[PDB]
Design a protein around this ligand. Structure first.
Ligand code: LU8
Ligand code: LU8
Ligand code: LU8
Ligand code: LU8
Lengths: 282, 290
């Protein structure tokens, strides 16, 4: 048998992590993440996870392959996935406003992907916590649902992006031996993503501009201390604009956000309870 | 791109194919899902650029591919058309020069694995045997199959025993593996297991070296004392209860080379693991033997 492995690289992202390319395999678009040597452990962790459980879910970025190739004086590490031409939710929210149906569809699809990660299924999958959930790690699909990407920090039962760190991460009180601690860190981050999306939902002719969480209280590339002072010491939370309280959908989403942001991690809603709440909105 | 041309091995591990890549033969190992933890471990080990060595099987690529619920696990290496030492020893006898070239090359590969470079961690193999040694056209061999390897760095005080329920080939297991008293958090324990197995491989090779117009037939270690397809408990009986070691044919004692090799084998087979020779000391001893 011939095994056609050639991928043509046709660049949609570049960072410290490495690069992401739009590629072609057998006439089909794929996404190719090429890891920097600095972030090899992210390739190893995602690969170890997919070797343990082949996740398949409409709201999880679809795995195609993990490739290690020997070079001259180095190892090349590629992760190949489904390609989502609309790009990340972070991207999408800058150039689009949302109606009620499109806002709910986005956030319920993210909750669905997250609840799938979190749930242990016997026979199935281990429970999984993401540990770096944010709008840049969510892709928009043509059908209006999203999918969650980047399991390089995931844990089965590098640090997370500081802007999205839960208070117990910033004050180093997280119970590191307790798997449920990691789910609760994801729920905090989910709540910040819900806030990012809800701002872009139009009501009564009003919308907020795209901003990242805590844009008004921390610098770009905020330090660990900058975040700890805001979230732990002062106990600040993202602003809920008055205009949301004229709209029943945004009023319900504001309540949901609040229940993801309790200082006490064990008070936070579960991903399954968030899904249920979202199915009863509208 | 790779063309799979012919199956050269098929068992519970999976299958190995001879394939073609850029005009060249390559070996393509397709793992069974039962052995997915070996695939991942081998991939971790081959990420070490300073692992590369004339007497370690050369890595080309490692892949995990999936669609729907079906996962394929591939390892692509150099291809050695002479096959494994296990295959070769059934087909040929050896002269002194060939016997020493083979066993020194295996010692050279094993010392390369065991010694930390400040780089490459120290590595213990845990499944050394004649089927896991490939014969090269230059008369040297290379060690294959790092799916059970343990890594250690003295420089950072880290030991990585991996997460693989696979155990070594039963016929080659040291007494402390068979009696399950091996100290699992001690890196030197795993090197000493490799030394026991190396001694067995030395014995397999030496039997095929002619002296005074005499050679022994190829036999695997403990062929005479265990059932075919021996169980863990079959091996524990002969190695641990019966304190059996491979017999040294008396014809070896006429030949200086085989007398030296019998001495080296015996120093790999002490019941006390800490009494066993190191891979470096074996390499140095074989460099001096003719
Ligand atoms: C190694 O590397 C890459 C391989 C591929 C790829 C290309 N064609 C065919 C395949 C294939 C899938 C599955 C089987 C089955 C069929 C028979 N069954 C009984 C067991 C095995 C065979 C072949 C693959 C896996 C794509 C790649 O990239 C997209 C690869 O590189 C990452
Ligand atoms: C988050 O993480 C990963 C994501 C992806 C991924 C999959 N589909 C599409 C993309 C994409 C395409 C295009 C744009 C646009 C954005 C606007 N403008 C700047 C031009 C380009 C952005 C994003 C990506 C980045 C793949 C990954 O691995 C292969 C990821 O890592 C796990
Ligand atoms: C990695 O990704 C892609 C792979 C492929 C692909 C190419 N050759 C063969 C296969 C295949 C055939 C048959 C089996 C099974 C069927 C049942 N039983 C008998 C065991 C064996 C598995 C696998 C596939 C899945 C195509 C893709 O897209 C068109 C892939 O996606 C980019
Ligand atoms: C041990 O382990 C691995 C080995 C290999 C590998 C590399 N060159 C040649 C071989 C070979 C070729 C042919 C025969 C013949 C011998 C006589 N008779 C029995 C018919 C068959 C045996 C052996 C192998 C098996 C590749 C691997 O990975 C790709 C290995 O796994 C790490």
């Amino acid at each position: 048998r011939t095994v056609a492995r050639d991928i043509t690289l046709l660049c949609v992202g570049k960072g410290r992590y490495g690069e992401v390319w739009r590629g072609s395999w057998q006439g089909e678009n794929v996404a190719v993440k090429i890891f920097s040597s600095r972030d090899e452990k992210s390739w190893f962790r995602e690969t170890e996870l997919y070797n343990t459980v082949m996740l398949r879910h409409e709201n999880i970025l679809g795995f195609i392959a993990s490739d290690m190739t020997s070079r001259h004086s180095s190892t090349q590490l590629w992760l190949i996935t489904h390609y989502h031409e609309m790009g990340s939710l972070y991207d999408y929210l800058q150039l689009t406003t949302l109606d009620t149906v499109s806002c709910l569809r986005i956030v319920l699809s993210i909750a669905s992907g997250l609840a799938h990660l979190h749930i242990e299924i016997f026979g199935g999958k281990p429970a999984i916590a993401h540990r770096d959930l944010k709008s840049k790690n969510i892709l928009v699909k043509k059908n209006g649902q999203c999918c969650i990407a980047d399991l390089g920090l995931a844990v089965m039962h590098r640090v997370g992006t500081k802007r999205y760190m839960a208070p117990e991460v910033l004050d180093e009180t997280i119970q590191v031996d307790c798997f449920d601690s990691y789910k609760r860190v994801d729920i905090w981050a989910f709540g910040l993503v819900l806030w990012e999306v809800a701002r872009r939902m139009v009501s009564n002719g009003i919308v907020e501009d795209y901003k990242p969480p805590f844009y008004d209280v921390v610098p770009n590339d905020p330090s660990f201390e900058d975040m700890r002072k805001v979230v732990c010491v002062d106990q600040q939370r993202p602003n809920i604009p008055n205009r949301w309280f004229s709209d029943p959908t945004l009023t319900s989403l504001a309540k949901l956000m609040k229940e993801c942001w309790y200082q006490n991690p064990s008070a936070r809603l579960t991903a399954l309870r968030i899904k249920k709440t979202l199915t009863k909105i509208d």
